[PDB]
Design a protein around this ligand. Sequence first.
Ligand SMILES: *[C@]1(*)O[C@H](CO)[C@@H](O)[C@H](O)[C@H]1NC(C)=O
Lengths: 178, 136
Amino acid sequence: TGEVTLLDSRSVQGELGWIASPLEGGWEEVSIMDEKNTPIRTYQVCNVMEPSQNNWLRTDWITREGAQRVYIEIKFTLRDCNSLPGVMGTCKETFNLYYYESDNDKERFIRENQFVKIDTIAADESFTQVDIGDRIMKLNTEIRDVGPLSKKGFYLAFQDVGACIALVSVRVFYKRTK
Amino acid sequence: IVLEPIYWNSSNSKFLPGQGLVLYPQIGDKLDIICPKVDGQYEYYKVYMVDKDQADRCTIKKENTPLLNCAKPDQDIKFTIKFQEFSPNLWGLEFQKNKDYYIISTSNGSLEGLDNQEGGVCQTRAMKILMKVGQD
Ligand SMILES: *[C@]1(*)O[C@H](CO)[C@@H](O)[C@H](O)[C@H]1NC(C)=O
């Protein structure tokens, strides 16, 4: 509770409407009822049987508010691929996190080579059955930071390479008094 | 494909007095349910997915979790259902073919009746969605 939110996907009640490549058949937006019994906006992709996956998801422009070091909290789940029909093999258990600094707050397209890789993020844990009643805290939480940041704001992008994954929330923040 | 959005309001004729709105969504489809917005006259609704017994009786359980909380009528509020059999999300909804699902609201449409556990517009205005997944 000593950190200022630059973005929280949970705060959006209408839709995130983030840009995605491909726009259909890759990352897709769906609602869920979260841990706090609140409907939120999430992104997911599960093209595990399809080869050569390169599914890009990209946030809207995020202002730094002049903070040169920014933290990125991603809460996500991984459906065990061998729980899906037909899928026999080894599961993709990672995705890649990128960023791109820009003064421009309305970048039109995802230009793949312009994004800089923050890290490959790994699922500590996977699941095979959806939770029906009360939300059990088995989501993965991974935090990374980026900086020093030079420009007015930046974009976060996620690359899926064939996992069965749901980004439950994305939270971007800076620490106010470290 | 994306089905036609359902706006949850009293001035919204998809809800027959008889048996309310009936849908036939197929596996893979998605559907938005939108709260009534006004830049007019305010409407307030808590919308729940429920089982057959609750829907018939127009009642809500104390542990039930509202898909949609239409407490902010000046704001855009929406729930996008994906009619998937296998959720990549631990907390996502899953559906199966030849099974019927139900959305209702026992709020009466006013601010003071938003928390009403039974009756409301489910009873009076037949505001009740039957979703016949994977059927004719
Ligand atoms: C009920 O929803 C809204 C009121 O917010 C209105 O615009 C709409 O025309 C109504 N009916 C339908 C089918 O959308």
